[PDB]
Amino acid sequence: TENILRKSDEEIQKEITARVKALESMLIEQGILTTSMIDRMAEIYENEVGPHLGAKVVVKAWTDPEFKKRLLADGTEACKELGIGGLQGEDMMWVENTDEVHHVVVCTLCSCTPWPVLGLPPNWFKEPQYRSRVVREPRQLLKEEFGFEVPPSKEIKVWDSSSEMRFVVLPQRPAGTDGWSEEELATLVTRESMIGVEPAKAV
Amino acid sequence: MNGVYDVGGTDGLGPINRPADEPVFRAEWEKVAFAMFPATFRAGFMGLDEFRFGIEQMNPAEYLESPYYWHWIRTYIHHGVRTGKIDLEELERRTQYYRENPDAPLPEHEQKPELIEFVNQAVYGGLPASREVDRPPKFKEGDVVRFSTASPKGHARRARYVRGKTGTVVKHHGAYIYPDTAGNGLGECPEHLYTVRFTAQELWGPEGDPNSSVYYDCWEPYIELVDT
Ligand SMILES: [Co+2]
């Protein structure tokens, strides 16, 4: 939104860059931060940990009734079966979408998300607009922002992750996918479908 | 604290800004900001709850429109100063130095295998906040409870929109680090954790969706029994 008091994005970026490089120089001299540490954290979340991991969990649940039960019973333990877990995903509780219920996740108090299965969240998920509105007008928000229309009669459960427990949505399996392989099914699972702002891809 | 950051239910923040696609890190400074998390954590600048409290104390206007990772930088500085690990004056001088010399080098330093070890361990092993306590859970599934109307001036996870509201316990997750103490440098003091369900009508009155409910996590002290 317009704010006549705000500097240009270019000026904002130039100031932040200098402030961060300055702080970085100090932490480096203190011996608690190094360039290899920086590069390692970045490579992990730019190429290793992402929503493709959550997709693997979803497709296994879609094709393994027993795994699905275990997943809904104890998310952290189930995902460990696939070597999936870790930082900010130490405690996961998966919730299943059905014809009677739709789940949507948010962190109104900040921006928490289960990185081990979704990777670092897109900026809109961490911003004030989505966080403030989703717990108050979830149906309208889903329609207006994501073009996702949830029938009035269908209940919308909004999960506000205020603790370290991380909620992840197990989207319903799209129709027309009988007998599909886990690899083929994975193409339908999106980060958005596991947040609940969109259903898995149709067709 | 009753900070602006507690946005759940706030009106007028505007439409969502969502590009078709975006990189994990939009600029090099963001990668640095991100990596400083495990770095300062290992260095004892702060714990996770304190980390959040530092961001909560930001200038509201700055918080609402600044890049997300800038919030991280503010909390690092906040705790660096609090713990006396960061000299604000030196930081200001260096900031000006890098403003005038953006391509100037960073200080010479030796790489440290233990820092990489820390990163891999934290990422793949995680930093579990679950803890064991001697007391049994006070509540159970099905209990009807009321969320406290307390308004701590320090850190807490008591969204203003659920205070004084009545809901039903959905699940007991065991005990975890307690924000109200941890975020204020008072220790983990673990408390049992529960997910509680609140109908939209209870939260928003008539303006609430007739067929929606919000699930919010509550540490034991946050709720008191209404009906078993
Ligand atoms: Co958060």
Torsion of Cα atoms, B178 then B180 then B182 then B188, to 10° = -30
Q: Which residues pair with A157 in a beta bridge?
A: A103, B213
Q: Is A149 exposed, middle or buried (0-12, 13-18, 19+ CB in 10 A)?
A: exposed
Helices first, then strands: H and E counts in chain A: 10, 4
Q: Among residues 66-125 of chain B, which lie with CB inside 8 Å of chain A?
A: 66-68, 70, 73, 76-77, 80, 85-87, 90-91, 94-99, 102, 106-107, 109-112, 115-116, 118-120, 122-125
**Alpha helix positions (H), B59-196:** 60-65, 68-82, 88-100, 113-125, 179-182
Domains of chain B with bracketed CATH: 1-126 (1.10.472.20), 130-228 (2.30.30.50)
- Interatomic CA distance for residues A33 and B18, integer angstroms: 33
- Interatomic CA distance for residues A132 and A109, integer angstroms: 9
As given in the structure block, the two tokens for residue B78 are 């906040």
As given in the structure block, the two tokens for residue B157 are 């996870």
> Cβ neighbours of residue A173 under 8 Å, at least 6 residues apart?
A62, A185, A200
The upper half-sphere exposure of residue A71, i.e. CA atoms within 13 Å in the direction of its Cβ, equals 25
> Cβ neighbours of residue A184 under 8 Å, at least 6 residues apart?
A177
CB B223 within 8 A of CB B196: yes
- Interatomic CA distance for residues B207 and A141, integer angstroms: 15
Q: Is B79 exposed, middle or buried (0-12, 13-18, 19+ CB in 10 A)?
A: buried
- Interatomic CA distance for residues A143 and A102, integer angstroms: 13
Mapped onto helix, strand or coil, the DSSP state of residue B54 is helix
The residue among A168, A17, A31 whose CA lies nearest residue B115 is A31
Q: How large is the angle between the packed helices B88-100 and A9-29, nearest 10 degrees?
A: 120
A160 CA from centroid of ligand 1 (Å)? 9
- Interatomic CA distance for residues A130 and A151, integer angstroms: 20
- Interatomic CA distance for residues A166 and B21, integer angstroms: 24
The residue among A166, A155, A54, A32 whose CA lies nearest residue A107 is A166
CB B73 within 8 A of CB B152: no
Mapped onto helix, strand or coil, the DSSP state of residue A79 is helix
Beta strand B144-147 pairing with B166-176: antiparallel
Give the Å distances, CA to CA, from A154 to A98, A151, A166, B161, B196: 9, 5, 24, 24, 20
> Cβ separation of B217 and A139 shorter than 8 Å?
no
CB A41 within 8 A of CB A27: no
- Interatomic CA distance for residues A46 and B87, integer angstroms: 32
As given in the structure block, the two tokens for residue B57 are 């104390």
CB B225 within 8 A of CB B143: yes
> Cβ neighbours of residue B222 under 8 Å, at least 6 residues apart?
B147, B148, B158
User: Strands, E, within chain A: which ranges?
Assistant: 91-96, 101-106, 155-160, 165-170
> Cβ separation of A87 and B127 shorter than 8 Å?
yes
- Interatomic CA distance for residues B37 and B4, integer angstroms: 23
> Cβ neighbours of residue B219 under 8 Å, at least 6 residues apart?
A163, B157, B176, B178, B179, B180, B191, B192, B193, B194
User: B85-117 burial by CB neighbour count: b if 16+ within 10 A, else e?
Assistant: bbeeeebeebbeebeeeeeeeeeeeeeeeebbe
CB A135 within 8 A of CB A129: no
Backbone angles phi, psi at B171, to 5 degrees: -165, 145
- Interatomic CA distance for residues A35 and A43, integer angstroms: 12
What's A164's DSSP letter? S
Q: Is A110 exposed, middle or buried (0-12, 13-18, 19+ CB in 10 A)?
A: buried
Chain-centroid distance, C-alpha B66: 17
Mapped onto helix, strand or coil, the DSSP state of residue A21 is helix
CATH code, A170: 3.90.330.10
Beta strand B223-227 pairing with A91-96: unpaired
> Cβ neighbours of residue B158 under 8 Å, at least 6 residues apart?
B147, B148, B150, B151, B152, B222
CB B214 within 8 A of CB A160: yes
> Cβ separation of A23 and B38 shorter than 8 Å?
no
Chain A nearest CA to B107, separation (Å): 6
CB B123 within 8 A of CB A49: yes
- Interatomic CA distance for residues A197 and A175, integer angstroms: 19
Using a CB-CB distance cutoff of 8 angstroms, which residues of chain B are in contact with residue A109? Answer: 5-6, 8, 52, 157, 159
The upper half-sphere exposure of residue B207, i.e. CA atoms within 13 Å in the direction of its Cβ, equals 8
What's A193's DSSP letter? G
As given in the structure block, the two tokens for residue B16 are 């969502």
Helices first, then strands: H and E counts in chain B: 8, 6
Helix (H) or strand (E) holding A75: helix A75-80
CA angle, residues A141, A76, A49, in degrees to nearest 5 = 70
DSSP string, B165-198: -EEEEEEEEEEE--HHHHTTTS----EEEEEEEE
DSSP string, A109-142: TS----HHHH-SPPHHHHSHHHHHHTTTSHHHHH
Interchain CB contact of B174 with A (< 8 Å): no
- Interatomic CA distance for residues B97 and B93, integer angstroms: 6
The residue among A102, A125, A124 whose CA lies nearest residue A112 is A125
Number of structural domains in chain A: 1
Domain that holds residue A202: 1-203
- Interatomic CA distance for residues A29 and A23, integer angstroms: 10
As given in the structure block, the two tokens for residue B106 are 């960073």
- Interatomic CA distance for residues A33 and B111, integer angstroms: 9
CB B216 within 8 A of CB A160: yes
Beta strand A101-106 pairing with A155-160: parallel
Helix (H) or strand (E) holding A28: helix A9-29
- Interatomic CA distance for residues B74 and B148, integer angstroms: 30
Any catalytic annotation for residue A79? no
Using a CB-CB distance cutoff of 8 angstroms, which residues of chain B are in contact with residue A133? Answer: 13
